[PDB]
């Protein structure tokens, strides 16, 4: 599966400094890069265009243990376009609700390039809550037919964090 964007089908209003404090991951699209267990967001905001993201996440052994990972990732907003976070691998935002409720979630669309010539992409739903809210499953569907995918496809995560 490949990529590219589009600007019309990005939120067109966002604040990067609605990411502040923990998301969870509670769907993902690639199943290399998105559907781990426990992965726990946390964001800061650096000035008023860059996002500071400290990311963990678990690896799951055959054992059936789990060694936990860590990574810190940067981005800056377009100052046009302000559902584009350039890395400081680029987000999109595709679909947002932050009302400061439980079901709050921001719906972020991401390519990356392994080369000049391959490149990589995924889909991940942040939300509030350790588990993926019933009552985004409307925005979520919506939003995943604008970048030409079928939400029934993507992965829901594991967040017992135990």
Known sequence: ????????????????????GKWYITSGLNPTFDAFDCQLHEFHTEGDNKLVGNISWRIKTLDSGFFTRSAVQKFVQD???????YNHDDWYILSSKIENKPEDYIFVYYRGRNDAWDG?????????????????????????????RD???FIRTDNTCG
């Not at 100052?79 to 976070?85: A, K, T």
């Not at 739903?125 to 979520?140: G, H, K, M």
């Open 151 to 153: 939400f029934s496809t």
């Open 79 to 85: 100052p046009n376009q302000p559902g584009v976070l």
């Open 120 to 148: 990589y992409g995924g889909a991940v739903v942040y939300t509030r809550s350790s588990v993926l809210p019933n009552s985004i499953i409307p925005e979520l569907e919506k939003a995943a037919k604008s970048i030409g």
């Open 1 to 20: 599966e490949f990529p590219a964007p589009d600007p019309s089908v990005l939120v067109q209003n966002f604040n990067i400094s609605d990411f502040n």
